[PDB]
Structure formats: structure tokens, C-alpha cells
């Protein structure tokens, strides 16, 4: 016998007591439990359950059998989770597979002693075999393989290991590649600064008595063809710094015009750049509420007391007509795979793999601490790795189910991220409605299934939602919050003398604090397979045309329709007044229209939209990262083309991403296509965003276009 | 005593859940969340105990209640959602009494004829300054309540004004050259005229229809075409499109193509029958109501607020967190949000004097005889408030909504209570903000939004408007479209038929013999924003890429070109979603010295392709008559009489009497009382997914505080 409230809260359930009904309600993930003290039975998700030991009330305190949690929550009356008897071949590496793969490479003599890992991931078996698993249950007959990418000092090495046979299949050094930043690089950088008298010197000049209070933040340095005076072949990071004044918000206290360049192979500062002294803003600016009181609000709950409409079977999700596989990657986070829509009995392919491709937050300011600053969060830091556990009921609604996921850390040890992903169903207005005059109304509710993931790199938090609509639409939303990267300036108000120079590149958002203008650019890789792999890309441009049919109208609304046959043409800006379809030319609906999906890389946003990259074309960043300046890309499927910024974007000299994948301008005619959507905002700051930035959203959409023969949510014919 | 619980409460509109295990009823309606056990002498209402005289009785597991149960429980007073109003707000709509009174005053005139009908009976609003002083300083309003009474005398419009405090007719003005809107009885008239026409019965026989009594008409306005339509300019005319009733409940799926009757309403006669080639009527049953579908098994989801709401509704005034505002209903534009303030640390700061739909238009792109003139001015021509669709509880709005009744005059001048006219609900909208600093505890708060939702159906589209108050000061306006598509009857069954290419020049083939004609939805919103005061300026901020003149390796920088927009003609513009447009207050600054502003975003996204302007050539009449369609943003000088982007009398208008007119003098917009108009819409190209019934599509607009506050507005009360 064990104390109920304490044990249940330790287990993650919410416990509610209703004194009028004398009834506990226990909620956790898919389980909604009702139990009265002294009763011999309980209710799990609407279903009766016999108890071995009743709940006993001793002294206004609930006690339960030590076995109650297993008997009630793992009873099988919660159907949310089902056992996976046959593993999906895209399942992520398990903890054991991660450990096995590390032993296999550590067994090589070429494995040097301080070697770190940038990625340990499933090597994807071939597409055709994976589709036949999902659609025909045909076993895949390859062994499980892992990509093991190692960073030996500054050297990158790619290995492949076979996990069934426990052998090493290849070992390829990659000359010229720089590695991504690893967690331990953060501490190194912070120690190197703590141990430089030269740095302490530099900081003393800037008014800082105590150099031990200085917080560093490490940045990749980009590539500028020697013009930043940094040699190409060293492992370098740039270091910006802030003053810890004890408000929990080092970000609010920048030490402007002071940059250290750190060589991580020498573990020393190798350059200090110093510009005008700007006094460090010092006023406490906490964002955690330590100085605040919230208003009392009344409680709101979203409850599903008979359980969920979805089923999670291992990593497979089933919900209404949708089925898909959800797996987690250390670089790009969640990946949605083998997505199909069940059209009256038949599973129809929609998307083979979908995931974040990459993202970049480049800044607009040419000064010493800014000019090179461009966060490539997934590429350079690893957004999977930096997943933020979801705060139950706040980051996601209280009817969510939260999943743990596992990936390798930089030392090769499996790391379990709790609450890495949230899945929840939500009400989203009426699905359709018609109220014919003087007739009974027709309305049905809209339901969306959301898959939500959060990653935090330095000062922003990014939120990605993959949204499945019952009617076949799929949305992808990207939200941004966190703390602005700010410049320390002399101006306190717009009336000060330096105000105008001070704000040339950003808004004054606090006294001495300027929010530097920048962009948020997200790129999604969507290997759509519209009812099969063989697809084509169709444009439909609504046009105003002279009326030629007679009568009083001078004009008409027509559609200009044409195919886009190759990769260079498919790389384009997106006009939200046009329609872009990925069609299957081999298959038609009942009316003879090619089954298609409409691609909408900009379906809206709460911040101003990027039309492309806010950079002149002669900028190195513009040259290295082509993906930034078009909204839409379509390339021929290739298992190894995965990242719009290239595989090794750190200090890269040219575009190894989407600029390379499209170089040879290949045919896109009736073939396996991969769609990439680039969507962006231009962020000009305002005081409302300081000291913490209310979440801002961009939206994208994939809508079925004559994929069905009729309203998909009408339901099956009697 | 007794009366049967389940039946009484469901009649009453409450949701009823019985929990067999807990032996407990949970009854839910609007702001009341009630728990009651059979036999208990008490019940719980929003967390408070309440004594019952008669307990809920169980007999053979039928539940029984006292015939006074409903008033005792739902009228207890433990539901605090609704409070009675202390001093009537000067913007409260006409009451049923006031409507009846206003009608008696004009009926007591010698000039009143018994055929006269009413297009509008509305509060004539007192002046803006006195209304603000009432809201902000509690100063009573000393002008008397007046009503606008707008009458249609056969084809003539008369505008009467009546004083209700003093019971008299202050004025009576015929308005020459104005046509009146379509009225509800016009629907019946047009259907009877067609049923009485032997010539129409013949036209319909030609096209396969042997039974003329199974034909359904629908009235359209005719527009203006400089005579090319062959129609008398002065007469009261409407065009009639026709459909075959086949008994599937969806006559919209069965057009009788190329048949138009023109009807003179005065004369009660068909004046002209335009015929073109014969196209066989599509006959296959296509019900949208599920008579032929399997109901899918879905598990329940409830959004519950078991201690009541965070908002209070005091008369028509709504209070929620830091917002206060006033809500009323107009027969032409529906809901109006007024005297909107944000409470900043004890000081109520002005945001918006009046906000409402201005007008809307759905113009088609097909030049054939049943199409070429077709453009629904849904509010202006039909009265969207009049056509309000009662919210379907749990479906049209979430299960935690409160549903308000509204009263407007009908066309004969009798008050009409519309049930469930507006839904108010609070909703979760993700994290308000979050930061997870590496190795520290998390910070996250939930975002909450308050939605005011109204739905209106005109013919075949159902429209859903949401006004959304974010806790942090943002205001969103979303427009949703659903219903049944206007379809053309055609000969092609599939795209393989010989006529397919021509049949689909103006629309997609969405069913056998059925084309969804391409069109646009264009919405316009009139927002009298008063950003912390009436005296505002318009500012542009265009992000630009400039050469780096500061040295270092960069070739370019990100900067902003800032300028004022000094006059109306300059303020009428396309919106580029990559730029920023602010209504500032040049007289008031935040702690940083920045003028307190709102950012106006007329296009914040949409589910359909976006309309860049009117999809018409510059020489179309519809184009000439309706300037509002081609610009996303207009700013004009406050004028109490300028309310409709399409003009006050848009039926068969020959020129622009709306935003084209309101801006034609190109007046100054420098530090003055400005009114913002947002035009936004979609180009609709149909697809099979939208037939027989169209899944709801949404467009979004946003108003965001810009340096209006000093910091993150949602941080919480400062303890330090
Ligand atoms: Ca290629
Ligand atoms: Ca593909
Ligand atoms: Ca104003
Ligand atoms: Ca004017
Ligand atoms: Cu930003
Ligand atoms: Cu439409
Ligand atoms: Xe990292
Ligand atoms: Xe799956
Ligand atoms: Xe997350
Ligand atoms: Xe970072
Ligand atoms: Xe168009
Ligand atoms: Xe494209
Ligand atoms: Xe596409
Ligand atoms: Xe009407
Ligand atoms: Xe108000
Ligand atoms: Xe209509
Ligand atoms: Xe504007």
C-alpha cells in the first residue's frame, strides 16, 4: 500500500478529486480513469475493470496497492498503444542498436581515442522494399544498417555498419568537410574564455570588473574567401558574450563589439576583434516570472474519456483514414514516412518521407559581432539532439499523448528524450456546413491530428506541427518563440543622438537594446508519391482573358495550364495566386482528371513574409545556400539528397544542397519527384517581443486535388 | 409535479451525460456546468453548491425532475456569465419595443403605403465623442435615441429618421435613383411568378422537364451593363436561375442551364426569357446530408470549463482579461464590435471605435447567359444579418461556447429573435511563448484566445466570421466559406468527352455533367481603429536590402525604408505581405520613444489561392462600380455615414458610391481620425473534393500591436 497522490504524480498522471461525487479522475496520455474509494471496480476509457485492492481513504488521504498503476494503466483497456509484432523497417535505431554500432566502430584500429559522433542513424533500406512492407506486408530482406559519422578532432569520417551480422562495411574519410558543432564544444569554448587573460583584459576595458560572470555563446563562422582573415582548414568558432547579472537572462546583457575566434583543435583564442566600447545594459530583465504574478484564470480541460481515435503501434500511427510512421533523427528531428490514405478500403500512397530539410536564421547587420551570424540550427547544431521536452498542457493541449524518443549523444551513448513529441487530436471548426433556407441544417465538425515537436538552439525555440486533416489535406506549421538576439547600443530612446545609427539595422526594443533585423527560413523535404512514384509537376495560373464567347462581359477567368518538365524550371518563386500540382499522369479520378496534390509553400504567417533572401546575390551566404531564395523545388528522388544546405554546411565553400541537387537540370516528367518547400519570414522587432517573444507562426499546406472523386469526409455509401 | 429529465433538458438545449459508475449527471449549457446525483438534495453549479427543493428522481432508470428544475438550476445566479447592465450602453441595438415603436411612428405618416417594406431598421448612432466618453469616463449621453428606418415603396427607397425618446418623425427623404435590396418575400414572389408562367413552363418542357411544379427558382440581382443586357434601368428587376428538384435535398446539383427569366416585381410578371442551347439536366441524386451515408464511429471529445468562464457579458458588453468591448447585431452586416479597449495596468487604452464586415462580393468568371451578370453582393443585396444561420451547438462552434440570441427587424417591420446568432468561446492556441534555456528549468505559458463567431448563409454559401482577441493585444479576423458550389450544367461526363475542353474553359469538371465555375470571394472589413486616441497617421515600413557602407566583408545589409502616407489616394494600395503598414499615434510614444502603433495585415494567409485584385479587365462595369475589389488596403477620414465599401445602394448602381467615392477627394490622413478598410479574398478554382459539399476554407487577417506596449504584454503583473 502506497500514497496515491504522490505515486501518481511521480508517474506523470493528473489526479482530480471531486468531493461532491466522491470520485477520483486520473488522466495520463490515452488513459482516462475513474475510481471511487472503496469500490471493487474502476472505469478505464469507458470500460469496467475489477480491482484486486480498492482505493482506501485514510485521514482525507488516498492509498492504493503498490501494484495499482500496473493493474490500472497497463491493463489493456487503454488501447492507445498496441504491440508491434513485426517492426517497420524505418524504425529508428534502438538503444541497443546504437550501442552495437558504437562497439563495431570502436573495434577498428583506425578509431582514434577522443573520437566523437555527429550522427548515428538508420541507413534507410530501399524505398520500394519499404513501400511493399507498408502496403503488402512483404518482409524486407536486408539486414539493419547504421550510418555512423565520426568527428576525429576536426576530421570527418563516414562509416557503415551491418547490425544483423555485426560487421563494418565501410570507412571513408571525408577531406574538406567540417563537422557540426557538438555539445562539448559549448563548455570548451566557455573554459577557453575563462582561461584567457587576454580576454579578461578585453572585458575589463568594457566595464566588467568580474570576468567570471561572462557567458559565452559559440557561433559558426561561415565562409568569406579569406576576407574575414580566417584560414579555411582550422576548426573555428566565433564567440559572442553576455554578462550574467543574476536575472536568469544573460541574453539581455550583450557585450557589444567583442568577438573571440576560437580554434577547438588548439583549444585557444586565436583572434580578438574589438570595436567601439558600448556599455553593457544592466537592468534585470527576467522572462521566467520571478518578478511577476499571473492573474487567476478559471480551469479549462480537453478530455477524451473513452480514449483516443488513433492507435500507436510501435512507431506507426493509425487515425481515421490515415496511416504513417513517425521516427526521430538527431539532425532534423521527426520524420513522417509511408503515409497513406485509406480510400474506401484501398490504401493510396501520399508521401514516402517528409521531414524538415534544414533552416537558417541570417542577420542583417554588417558590424563586427553580426556580419557572419547565420544560425543553421539543424545543420550546424542538430535540432533532434536539442529537442525540448514538451511541457504538458502548455506546449501542447491537455488531451495530448506525449512520446519519448531515443537518439545517440555525441559520445555514442543512447539518450532518451522524454516528451519529445506530442500527438493530439483537435477540434478545428466545422468541416463543412450548409443551412438551406427553411430546411434542417447540415454541419459536421472538423478534426485535425497534430504531431508537434519543439527544438531549442541557443536563444530560439522552434515549434513544428504536422497536421493531418480528415479530408486528405496535410498542413505543416512552424512557430518561433524565445529571446531575441540583441545589440547593445548607447541610445535609450529614439530621442537620443545615436538613435538613428543605432537603429539602422533593427528596432529599439529596450533601453540600450536593439533587436537586429533578420530572417527565419525553413525548408521542408517532402518526397510525395501521389498515388504512386511516377509523378509530374503541373502549373495552373489563373488569368484574366478577353471574352470571345459574346454577350456583355469584356473578360473572363481562365486557367493557363502547362507542365514543368525539369529541375531548373521547377526551382521557382511562389505566387500565392497560382496553383502548383504534383500530379500522377498515369491515374485519374471518376471525371478523368489526373489525381494530384496541390502544393502551397505559403499559406500564411503572423510575421511579414520573405520573398526570398534579404541579401545581394554577391554575398557568400547567398552563394552557399541557394535554397533560401526560391519557395519551391522539385528534384528527382535520390536516397542521399536530404538537406537543402548540403550534408556538411559548416564553413562550406559552395552549395552542396539544393543548388547541387538541381545542377544537371534533370527531367521531371512522369518520374519519382521530391518536393522541397522553402518558407520564410522577415523579422523586424518590436517592444512587444522583449524580454520574451510571443510565438509567431508560418503555415504551409498540401491539399488533395482531384485525388478523390468527391467530398472525402462525406463518408462511406450505405 | 414531475417532468422527464432527458427530454426537458434536451428541449432546453442542454447537453446531458449520465455516468452509470459515479451515479452522476453532468448537464452543460453555455456558461453553466452542473453536476447532480439522483436523490441528492444539493447540486453543483460551476463549483458552487445549490440546494434543490425536489431531488432528481430515478424510476426504472428513467430520470425525472421537478417542472421548476431548469429555472432553479440554470437561473440560480451561480452561473455568473451574464450580468444585468447598470446603465444601458448608447450603442445597444434597437430592442423589440424600439423596433415596434419606430414602425408605428412612420406608419402614422400620410405617406406610408401598405405595400411598403423595410430594408433596414437600425440605431442611428450618437456621435463618436459622446460614445467614447460614456465608455471611458462614464459620462451619460444627452442626445435622444434615434433610429434609421429605410423603406422600400415598390421600387423607391425612402429614408426616415425617428426620435424614440420623444416619439416623433424627424425626417422623410425619397432617394431618387436608388434600388433597394432583395427582400425575403422576393424569394416567394419570384417562385410563384414562375409557377404561374405558361411560357416558362414551355421553356422548361423544351429541356426535358415535363413537371414544371418541381422547378426551384433563385433570385439574383442583375447588375449594370450600360444597356447591353437589354433591361430597363429604372424598373425593379431580378434575374431567375432554375434548378430541378429530384428529391435528394440538393437542387443546386441539378441546374437547368441557359435558362434565365427576368422578373418585374412591381408588375408581378416575367418581362423577358433569355434562352440559349439546351443542355440535359443532370439527374443523379447527390445528397449532401448523409441520407445515403454510414455515420462513422468517433470517440467523444469535450472542452469543459467546470468553474465557469473567464469572460462576463454585461448586457451586450463583454469583458475578458484586459479587453472590453461591445457587441451588437445589424441586419445588413451582422455583428459589430465597438468601443474596444485594452486595459494596460489600470488605464483603458483605445484600440478600435467600430469594427465590422464592410461588404463582400463573389464574382464569377463565365460569360454565358446564366453567368455573365452573376456577382453576389451578399450583405448589400441580401442582408447578411437577416440571413444569420443559428449556430449548431458543438459543431459550428466548440462545446465550450456560449451562444447569444439576437433581435433584428424583419422586412415587414416585426422584431425577429434569431436563436444562437453568435457564439463566444475561449480557446487554447498553443504556447503563448516558451523558452527552454540549456540546462535550466523550462518557461512556457499557454496562449488563450477569445472568439466571437457569426455565420450567415446566402443561397448556396455559408460564411463564417471570427473576431479573435488575443490576450497579448493582437486582433484577428478570419473568414470561412463552405456550402454548395454554383455549378454549370454541361455535356461532358469526363474529360475524355468531345465537349470537355469547352465545357471547362471557365471551371473544373467536378462531377458527371457538372462544372464548378471559377470565381472569387472578396471580403472587406471596415475598422475604425483609434490607436490610443483618434488622431492617427499612416506609416509604411518597407524592408529593403541596402549596400553595406560600414566596411567588413558583407556586401549588403537589411534596412527599412520608413515614410508617411499623407492622403487617401496614396493610402488606397495593394498589400505586399513582405512590407509593414502601421496606423500610428504620432502624439503618444512608448517608453522607447516609438509612436504607439498597430500593424495592419490584410492578408495573413488562406487555404485557397489568394486574389491579387479583382479578376476582371479594367473596362468591366462590375470593375468600375466596385473599386473596393482591387486594393487590399484603404484609409479614409472618419465619417459617420461612410459604412459600406460597395456604397449604400449597390443594386444596379452605375458608378462607385463606396470606397471609390469616400476617397475621391484625396483628403489628408495626417494626424487625424482615420478608418482602415481591409480587402481580402480568394480565387476559387474548383476540385472534386468540393462536391457535393465544400469543406470549409479560411482566409486570415491580423491587427498586431506595434510598440503599443513597452514589453511582452503577457508577462504578468510586476511585483517589483
Ligand atoms: Ca537531381
Ligand atoms: Ca516521390
Ligand atoms: Ca479612427
Ligand atoms: Ca474621405
Ligand atoms: Cu525572429
Ligand atoms: Cu468559392
Ligand atoms: Xe550542439
Ligand atoms: Xe504505417
Ligand atoms: Xe518537443
Ligand atoms: Xe547557439
Ligand atoms: Xe482568373
Ligand atoms: Xe514547382
Ligand atoms: Xe509542387
Ligand atoms: Xe433576403
Ligand atoms: Xe465596452
Ligand atoms: Xe440567393
Ligand atoms: Xe495603407
Numbering used by the authors:
A (entry chain A): 7 to 724
B (entry chain B): 6 to 725
Give sentences from the paper.
In bacteria, they play a role in general nitrogen catabolism. They contain a protein-derived cofactor that is generated autocatalytically by post-translation modification of a conserved endogenous tyrosine to generate 2,4,5-trihydroxylphenylalanine quinone (TPQ), requiring only the presence of copper and molecular oxygen. TPQ is situated in the core of the protein at the end of a well defined substrate-access channel next to a type II copper coordinated by three histidines. ECAO is distinct from Gram positive bacterial and yeast CuAOs in that it possesses an extra 9.3 kDa N-terminal domain, which gives ECAO a characteristic ‘mushroom stalk and cap’ shape.
Bio­chemical and structural characterization of ECAO indicate that the binding of oxygen in the active site is similar to that of the other family members; however, it is possible that the presence of the additional N-terminal domain, which is located at one end of the structurally conserved β-sandwich, could alter or provide an alternate pathway for oxygen entry. In order to investigate this possibility, we have determined the crystal structure of ECAO in complex with xenon at 2.5 Å resolution. The Xe atoms were bound in hydrophobic pockets located in either the amine substrate-entry channel or around the conserved β-sandwich oxygen-entry pathway. Two Xe atoms are bound in the amine substrate-entry channel. Xenon 4/11 occupies a site between Tyr381 and Tyr387 that is equivalent to that previously observed in AGAO and HPAO. We did not observe any xenon-binding sites inside the lower half of the β-sandwich near the ‘bottom’ entrance to the putative oxygen-entry pathway. A final xenon, xenon –/10, is bound at the edge of ECAO in a hydrophobic pocket and is not close to any previously observed xenon position. No xenon-binding sites are observed in the ECAO N-­terminal domain itself nor does the presence of this domain appear to affect xenon binding in the lower half of the β-sandwich when compared with other CuAOs for which xenon complexes have been determined. These observations indicate that the N-terminal domain does not play a role in oxygen entry during ECAO catalysis, which is consistent with the lack of conservation of the N-terminal domain across the CuAOs.
